[PDB]
Design a binder for this molecule. Structure first.
Ligand SMILES: CC(=O)N[C@H]1[C@H](O[C@@H]2[C@@H](O)[C@H](O)O[C@H](CO)[C@@H]2O)O[C@H](CO)[C@@H](O[C@@H]2O[C@H](CO)[C@H](O)[C@H](O[C@]3(C(=O)O)C[C@H](O)[C@@H](NC(C)=O)[C@H]([C@H](O)[C@H](O)CO)O3)[C@H]2O)[C@@H]1O
Ligand SMILES: CC(=O)N[C@H]1[C@H](O[C@@H]2[C@@H](O)[C@H](O)O[C@H](CO)[C@@H]2O)O[C@H](CO)[C@@H](O[C@@H]2O[C@H](CO)[C@H](O)[C@H](O[C@]3(C(=O)O)C[C@H](O)[C@@H](NC(C)=O)[C@H]([C@H](O)[C@H](O)CO)O3)[C@H]2O)[C@@H]1O
Ligand SMILES: CC(=O)N[C@H]1[C@H](O[C@@H]2[C@@H](O)[C@H](O)O[C@H](CO)[C@@H]2O)O[C@H](CO)[C@@H](O[C@@H]2O[C@H](CO)[C@H](O)[C@H](O[C@]3(C(=O)O)C[C@H](O)[C@@H](NC(C)=O)[C@H]([C@H](O)[C@H](O)CO)O3)[C@H]2O)[C@@H]1O
Ligand SMILES: *[C@@H]1O[C@H](CO)[C@@H](O)[C@H](O)[C@H]1NC(C)=O
Ligand SMILES: *[C@@H]1O[C@H](CO)[C@@H](O)[C@H](O)[C@H]1NC(C)=O
Ligand SMILES: *[C@@H]1O[C@H](CO)[C@@H](O)[C@H](O)[C@H]1NC(C)=O
Ligand SMILES: *[C@@H]1O[C@H](CO)[C@@H](O)[C@H](O)[C@H]1NC(C)=O
Ligand SMILES: *[C@@H]1O[C@H](CO)[C@@H](O)[C@H](O)[C@H]1NC(C)=O
Ligand SMILES: *[C@@H]1O[C@H](CO)[C@@H](O)[C@H](O)[C@H]1NC(C)=O
Ligand SMILES: *[C@@H]1O[C@H](CO)[C@@H](O)[C@H](O)[C@H]1NC(C)=O
Ligand SMILES: *[C@@H]1O[C@H](CO)[C@@H](O)[C@H](O)[C@H]1NC(C)=O
Ligand SMILES: *[C@@H]1O[C@H](CO)[C@@H](O)[C@H](O)[C@H]1NC(C)=O
Lengths: 166, 314, 166, 314, 166, 314
């Protein structure tokens, strides 16, 4: 969706979370972090690890002998089998990780897009999309009004009148 | 107001369905490569067989005197171990090993065989104790005098227990036909064995073999599992190594082959000859023949799992 | 995308379909169901079942004997093999369902978002996004005008003039 | 106007790539647990061997008189089944079973062996018919008189059919060396067998075995598949149970072992000893040794597949 | 997302790329192609092929004999094993392709939606969404102004004044 | 301005997680069906055994005179190949084949066995060279005169090399007991064989077999791998086919069975009897027993991979 698309890069300064707001107004410049977006992405990645870091209760024992070789014919069937199973698990492993990585990336991209379009709807015509993940304000929001946006309390009408004119 | 995501200077390349070497913010390993070079045996009843071979615990060469009735959760075979004192081998030897590896150890019981008209104290310098001895659980039956004949004998043992009885016996192959008669007399020697499930027969075969332990003779060991209430019968006329005691399996265990030391400071469930694989990871690239409860063996050295978003720097 | 996000919950009253409209105006309150959105999601889930409920024509026979045990060595190789294959299928099964469930959920979330953004474009500036999956009308639509929205015939111009003012 | 989705009061927890126990609107089971405790055999030519052991159909003990030429799509072995009347067993017995399980049944054919200078009506009380009888497809060859010698005989049979001929014979092991001579005379007894693909030999082995069916003797059964146009030759001098008829495989079938009853009211293709697994599901947790055409065996009891969206209530 | 949804069909005339613009104005009608959208989708499909067209370095040899059959018991274990592995790979193959095809389709649908919503944000209130993937202009853009949109240089303000009125 | 995507008149139906037969713009095959009906052997040292059977290279029947010391990366067995001139077979024959298929070829070495008091030039019309000959690597040992006795001999060979020595010998089974004495004299004949790892014995078994190559006798071939510095000893008194030379494995190779011609114009690593599977595809539906380095065998004929978007025409 979004991500490395209309957001050309990420913020190496944002060390408080995965996703955050960076604003500029009269009182200066500031940068915060969105806990609920960050935690949702984190809890989902965590859910993958718990499921993949997994323990088998299936015990296997020797059918082979490395001190004294078993008979060749049965020995060859055993190796042939073991190798076949190795190929299967090597395959499963490679596919699993590649599949999981594709989804992890898309999931993190998704959570960003979900956050963005929620802010866009958190206001109204009181702002317009700059295009690069920025929201231009037509009523000059201050550091208290910005906090109203961050903790989700910004009123999509009690700045409308003013912003509509601009 | 502008929003975005976090990023780092140095990310980690991973693989996806569509890209190879795509950098993400954070990743974690999925394939175990770290081995601990000891047999982690904390909290497990462990028996290190050392110089005693596993099959030796049933017959009783001197190296296995301390292992005649062992009891374990974990059995370790060693390369230096030998099943034999007097040169010989087991027919169907590996099947018996796999049985004994998971036996939980063995419990011995006298079969009560008594004899009349023969000898029973046959020994050798290959089995050193006080002096020349023999397999502790076996008896070397000859003829009474330095020659003479061997009476066609018949011995039976009924398994009186609720568990299958491991029965084992031996056929002695002399160096010469002369040696065979010097021991058990002349003529065709025959050993027949049967139960309510088993059906076989055996004949000696004198001849010159190469010297092992100083001797050119061999003893052929054979075995069968005697079911509860079922009876086994030995029909013989010489060249016969009789069982003195039978074996019963104690319970459950895991058997490994290894060259590293035991360590009661670490716990493990996945073993191989080079040590213990302690890991939570789903896969491992250490040893394809690792046994116990292990991650799956894969041929790849490394497979990184993304634990973060795509890393996109300035 | 949408789903349990900006739509805080679902309607236990909607028993006529998976997705539906709930409006309020002068003539009162009503609730319907969108057939084409519901049927598209249903037909896709159905497509998964037909593909997973599947029949093998591969016959397997005994290589084992439970009345009279086969020889131990070959017996152990057989069990070792059977167990290995069991591990593979247990794995395949668990991954398949988890993978399929992830996609089923996202697919149902997708079809909702596809329906929503289609209504948003079905009109124009004649309405604005409330934020919680609701569309505020600035020209007071009635029960006939609502049906025009539902069966996709609402004119994005023949209410414009009026709605623009508000 | 506000839009949304449907929801329910009580959903079903399922598992995803990222969550465990996430509730969805509707789900469906993927692992079969429902067994039907009967052998579903509707529309299949079925043979319940009952007391007749499968190998017994080739040799013909009294329990198998009604099964000497059976014809089936589905063969059922029973625990109470025995291959034997006179105590003995088959060398390579399980291979022969697997062959016979998929044989589609057998077709017998006289091998035309005639004899001169011996007996051929050897019987026993272990094989009860009118009185003391024997294996219906076999002949117990002795010496003419209560002692005497056994002429070094040579019998050959050429497979004249386009299908491989199942040949079977027996070696008789007497209770004593005395009994062996009382039957076939004294001296070393030898049975040699060869084809254009086979190469083996056999010797009797008299001795005391435990009593089975009242007898302490045993009969060793052996078998080989004779290719079309190829000839098998029997060279013998006693202790030999001769084949009277050869066997040919009818076609194709499936063989199972079971303890439950046949039911011609239900159809099934996946069987195990405890019954029939009738299912459309891709997986099953009933029996890992189920045979036929089955869902894959998995170790999990249950795996729910989401057939609905995430359930989000008020 | 988009695709066979609010875009009822595709252009069999567009042979220069996967995604392209089709405009109409005073100077007539024209059709082009977007290289960066087409190349991104192509490079991703290519990435799948390189990963699936793959070579094993695992050698297997005969454990079977088709001139002279091995003993039946070991023969049956071998076939039983080989068939089991066949079932696994037949399964893996069918699932892989079906999984990969689902993602390929969604990926191509995604890249279209990413292109569309980028044009929508490339302008401003200077245009409105027609609904079927078309953008109605309220300032009558010409063949030079169209190129400004295609090569991403259209100014979201230097036509605003005019377009706002309409 | 309106945007969209490309489309075609005729797309390709593929399968997805949710749909069967969905048309996409472009697709590509994933399962290989194209076989090349030749053994692609470009750049490989290839040995086509032709009429020489693989096991024959060790013993040396006339068909294998040109293959006594072959050297290869790729070994091809042919249906017309025979291991034998004088009718007989190998005990544990398939194990030996698998060993020889990957041996990289063999290197022969004289074992230096000399004899006194017997013959050593036994021949037959089944082994045609100048006239009646024998296995080139073997020696047929009889008694000096048209009858007479065979001295209880003892021969030993020590493996002086760093590689395991393939030792092979033969037991001769005469047509009659008369023929056996005419060759090696009367009495019980015994061949015993042992190393520091091996333990077995052998007895001849005269009798009438069917005629193969004109002869009703058979030779039983046996083999063992002699470890470096370990010694093998042969104790015998007749009916014994002695090894003249031992075999050593050259290195590494791959062995196949095939009926198609060699082609040095094409390169391949995946082989089957019907030719070479040259492919980059991950799967194949040509032959489940293909060996070498191959795509996985799958049972599906075709599986199309989407390389384009969904095709939606006007
Ligand atoms: C040192 C050596 O190689 N000599 C062995 C000898 O071979 C001869 C060669 O020395 C000579 O160079 O060449 C000859 C041919 O030209 C021979 O190949 O063979 C003799 C036997 O014939 C060997 O004697 C054995 O020596 C052993 C020590 O290495 C030991 O002393 C053996 O005695 C035993 C034994 O202790 O095991 C003595 C036991 O009391 C007796 N017990 C019973 C119950 O009978 C056993 C028993 O008879 C055998 O173990 C059964 O096979 O014998 C002695 O046999 C010599 O090593
Ligand atoms: C009841 C019992 O245990 N007795 C068997 C006896 O063992 C002796 C013990 O009784 C005694 O307490 O201790 C002794 C040593 O101190 C012995 O162990 O052994 C005899 C044979 O020596 C057994 O006789 C058998 O009894 C069978 C019934 O259970 C039966 O009557 C057997 O006769 C047959 C037979 O019917 O199968 C008679 C057949 O006509 C004859 N057919 C042919 C073609 O020869 C067969 C045949 O000879 C054998 O089946 C071949 O091995 O014999 C009879 O042998 C007694 O059970
Ligand atoms: C043609 C045929 O079937 N005749 C074979 C014969 O069987 C008899 C039948 O012909 C007759 O109709 O019915 C009879 C019973 O009523 C018999 O079944 O049996 C004789 C032997 O008894 C066969 O003679 C063999 O013929 C061979 C050619 O096919 C060959 O000439 C054999 O001579 C050899 C040989 O060349 O291999 C001659 C060798 O010099 C000698 N070498 C040594 C070192 O001893 C070998 C050797 O003795 C044998 O190969 C070992 O078993 O003999 C000749 O044996 C006849 O084919
Ligand atoms: C079986 O595989 C092992 C490696 O896992 C190898 O060392 C051994 O040589 C193989 N056995 C045979 C029969 O060669
Ligand atoms: C990197 O990934 C691992 C995965 O468990 C995690 O433990 C670690 O905390 C991560 N590092 C960061 C920067 O969070
Ligand atoms: C063995 O025989 C004894 C006789 O008292 C009996 O109690 C026991 O149950 C028997 N065991 C079996 C299982 O046959
Ligand atoms: C093989 O596995 C079965 C269970 O499937 C078990 O009952 C049996 O004991 C095993 N066989 C051996 C050799 O123990
Ligand atoms: C629940 O799922 C199963 C899956 O086939 C379906 O048959 C059933 O109709 C579903 N129930 C509802 C509420 O539709
Ligand atoms: C067997 O021999 C007969 C002789 O007429 C012949 O017709 C038949 O084809 C032969 N069968 C085979 C396959 O050798
Ligand atoms: C093993 O499978 C092959 C086909 O791959 C078949 O031709 C052969 O008959 C089978 N072997 C046995 C024991 O039937
Ligand atoms: C169709 O797909 C294959 C996949 O590699 C590709 O080589 C070929 O160029 C494609 N055709 C078109 C129209 O691009
Ligand atoms: C074999 O014996 C010779 C004696 O010189 C020795 O050099 C060689 O290392 C020995 N080989 C082995 C591995 O025992």
């Amino acid at each position: 969706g979004a991500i490395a698309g209309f957001i050309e890069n990420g913020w190496e300064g944002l060390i408080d979370g995965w996703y955050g707001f960076r604003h500029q107004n009269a009182q200066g410049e500031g940068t915060a972090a969105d806990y609920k977006s960050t935690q949702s992405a984190i809890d989902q990645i965590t859910g993958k690890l718990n499921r993949l870091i997994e323990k088998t209760n299936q015990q296997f024992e020797l059918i082979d002998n490395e001190f004294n070789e078993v008979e060749k014919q049965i020995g060859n069937v055993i190796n042939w089998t073991r190798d076949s199973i190795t190929e299967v698990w090597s395959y499963n492993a490679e596919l699993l990780v590649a599949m999981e990585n594709q989804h992890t990336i898309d999931l993190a991209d998704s959570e960003m897009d979900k956050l963005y379009e929620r802010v866009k709807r958190q206001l109204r015509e009181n702002a317009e999309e700059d295009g690069t993940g920025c929201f231009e304000i037509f009523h000059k929001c201050d550091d208290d009004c910005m906090a109203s946006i961050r903790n989700n309390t910004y009123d999509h009408s009690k700045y409308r009148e003013e912003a509509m004119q601009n | 107001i502008c929003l975005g995501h976090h990023a780092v200077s140095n990310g980690t390349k991973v693989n996806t369905l569509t890209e190879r070497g795509v950098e993400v913010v954070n990743a974690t390993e999925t394939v175990e490569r770290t081995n601990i070079p000891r047999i982690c045996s904390k909290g497990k009843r462990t028996v290190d067989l050392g110089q005693c071979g596993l099959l030796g615990t049933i017959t009783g060469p001197p190296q296995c005197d301390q292992f005649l009735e062992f009891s374990a959760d974990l059995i370790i075979e060693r390369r230096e171990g030998s099943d034999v004192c007097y040169p010989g081998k087991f027919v169907n030897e590996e099947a018996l090993r796999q049985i004994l590896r998971e036996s939980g150890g063995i419990d011995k019981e006298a079969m009560g065989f008594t004899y009349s008209g023969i000898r029973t104290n046959g020994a050798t310098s290959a089995c050193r104790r006080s002096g020349s001895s023999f397999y502790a659980e076996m008896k070397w039956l000859l003829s009474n005098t330095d020659n003479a004949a061997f009476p066609q004998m018949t011995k039976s043992y009924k398994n009186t227990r609720k568990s299958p009885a491991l029965i084992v016996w031996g056929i002695h192959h002399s160096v010469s036909t002369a040696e065979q008669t010097k021991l058990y007399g002349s003529g065709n020697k025959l050993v027949t064995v049967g139960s309510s499930n088993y059906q076989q027969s055996f004949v000696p075969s004198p001849g010159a073999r190469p010297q092992v332990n100083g001797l050119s003779g061999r003893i052929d060991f054979h075995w069968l599992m005697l079911n509860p209430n079922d009876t086994v019968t030995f029909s013989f006329n010489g060249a016969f190594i009789a069982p003195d005691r039978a074996s019963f399996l104690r319970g459950k265990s895991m058997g490994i082959q290894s060259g590293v030391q035991v360590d009661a400071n670490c716990e493990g469930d996945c073993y191989h000859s080079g040590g213990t694989i302690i890991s939570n990871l789903p896969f491992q690239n250490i040893d394809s023949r690792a046994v116990g409860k292990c991650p799956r063996y894969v041929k790849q050295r490394s497979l990184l799992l993304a634990t973060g978003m795509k890393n996109v720097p300035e």
